[PDB]
Design a protein around this ligand. Structure first.
Ligand code: NA
Ligand code: NA
Lengths: 219, 219, 223, 223
């Protein structure tokens, strides 16, 4: 393992949603062993975003999960080479997003992760919560981690809290591919809890916070 | 609330899977405040079952969940009238099951739940783990509970451990309908951990155990 | 050797529940297997008036009644007299879902009657959706896609209910067909369906149903 | 007023990634909008040889090229000169999934050319599935189901790739069509498609593609 308790984050995201192109960059940092990260985002091309910013935030690194010793940590072993993930996000009204992230060490040697993120979304109804920007936050969640074909899969049932109560459900299916041979975990869970801690009125500037911890289910 | 710490369970299940009809009955008991239940099942019609018994076990009562005080307990408030649920189970190879349970107090006044269960499954490939009986157990899981249309919904990502490693994924979507007006909870989670503790060779006699506890996600 | 006449009878019994609501329905009808046409008269004998839209049932009420061109292998007409069965799932877009099965054999008295043992199960329809609120008009005509897997026949169709005051409510079908004996297996092909309720009393306790169905192999590549 | 000639050109640029693998593809072709026929020549200009089956791309490479009978409203031919765009999702049965978009307008120099700006994105294809292992033969012909929602056009089709050594690999399409201006909206109808790769070099850097497409309104109820 090549991970410090204090680490930086740099990221660039390039995407379109319902055809609307956009670019976002972010500088942040976090504590890989506490499972905590912060990031400051800026919409550098394509703002104000027509859609709810919340659909983006999950694309903005499972290195930042506090793993107990008794569970193998696919992610912390993948470095310095890194890993990537690819994800699908099926919303219950037919809307869907794919996203990919390639995560590696900054080439200058320093304590920083570089993230290359692609994000694409189609079929959101013009009148649904995403297009109408009526989302409040993602609820905390529990991702389920298991192995297939010698790589790691994680599936989570996600839910957006809507304005005036009510939830809007989304199913995630992620694949994690380490850039080198690493020890493979047994079935386990990761609790996540992510929230937007600050944003300007049109979400051109957004600060994001996640806390994440792994476990192996009820005794 | 009309619930004792010690309570009996009686149940009858009637179903077909890939057209193969069957009847199962069960006597058991559990501790509604500890979130623990036991049941003894018998296949009284249609045995030996062509398919994996594991697909059945989740149909064999969210009253048996240990709820903390800070979370509203939809289920324990529904009694003595009871509640019902309806569920769908989407397996990743195309196989799918629906099930329903009507839960009420035994009519003789005693400390016993009566369960009327219907179970139907179609489209399991002749060569998949279910038809080939290659399942080992359901992994522990975390159901996600939220309200819609004044009733309670719970969705869980389930996974069967297969012989020689490997998992076989299933998505649950349950609806819970209390038979009277009850206080409605906020979004929360229920950890489940269920296992077959004993069975004869052809699964005509099976003993089942679940432990279940509610919580509200990572601090 | 096929055992099918151009005139054939249909007898059926359907037993189900939808959102927990139990019901039984029987039906007498007849059809013309080579023209791909069938008629049936249904009676709700237990559980009526039905809380849900009758439309969600009608598709469970036999692919023998499809007009097959000679150049397409007919899985169904070869399966007789032994018959076949099917299993189906029906995924509605609002989360509602139904499974159904049918076991189809020749009436035991030797006459030219198909006997249909049908089971039907529906869960998770929103209290306020078109199905529970009974706001459906009809199924649009459709094209089922037939293909082989694991030595049996699969057919998947995009279905759509027309709602009151326009608008459609989508459903995805996934059916499996299992012949009771070894039969010659078809290439990828299509079945057009067009089914409608031709008559019903106010509460749908009595319903007459009509389907016309024809197989084909998709648009010619040349103009 | 429609602005469509019977002879029309096609220019396109597609930019994507699949399983993270970036690529660019451009194409020159032409078609006959009233016969429902189109041709295109594709070049992989960046990212070749492609690790994945080229077949998963070809459907992104214009519903103007459908022969519409007079009795069916043609959403697409009315949308011009301004054009329309579509967004699509493609759900493969092994978990693989692709989204794509196309923005279709008239070439700015006034000539009779459609310009297509296409984006394509694919994730979660198993390393060992037909797509990554390049084991596809062709898409079977299909019937798309067209219906209206929220004042735009939706079309959903059950697609199927024929694999090497028989067997099919299913995919569900869900497309949305958005005209760039107010146009008359159609009733529920169908489009038959039949598309094939007519020519390619060994690594699919160069591919010629042909589609024939015709609309209809489903099997007559009468024999
Ligand atoms: Na903290
Ligand atoms: Na215990």
């Amino acid at each position: 393992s090549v991970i410090t308790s204090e680490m930086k984050i740099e990221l660039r995201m390039e995407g379109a949603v319902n055809g609307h192109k956009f670019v976002i960059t972010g500088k942040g940092s976090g504590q890989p062993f506490e499972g905590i990260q912060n990031v400051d985002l800026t919409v550098i091309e394509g703002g104000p975003l027509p859609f709810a910013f919340d659909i983006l935030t999950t694309a903005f690194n499972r290195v930042f999960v506090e793993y107990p010793e008794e569970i193998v940590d696919y992610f912390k072993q993948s470095f310095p080479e890194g890993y990537s993930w690819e994800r699908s996000m099926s919303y219950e009204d037919g809307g869907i997003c794919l996203a990919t992230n390639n995560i590696t060490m900054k080439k200058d040697g320093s304590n920083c992760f570089v993230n290359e993120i692609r994000f694409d979304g189609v079929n959101f109804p013009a009148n649904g919560p995403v297009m109408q920007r009526k989302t409040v936050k993602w609820e905390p969640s529990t991702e389920k981690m298991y192995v297939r074909d010698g790589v790691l899969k994680g599936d989570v049932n996600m839910a957006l809290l809507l304005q005036g109560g009510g939830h809007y459900r989304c199913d995630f299916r992620t694949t994690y591919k380490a850039k080198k041979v690493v020890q493979l975990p047994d079935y386990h869970f990761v609790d996540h809890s992510m929230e937007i801690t600050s944003h300007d009125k049109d979400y051109n500037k957004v600060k994001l916070y996640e806390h994440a911890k792994a476990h192996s289910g009820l005794p």
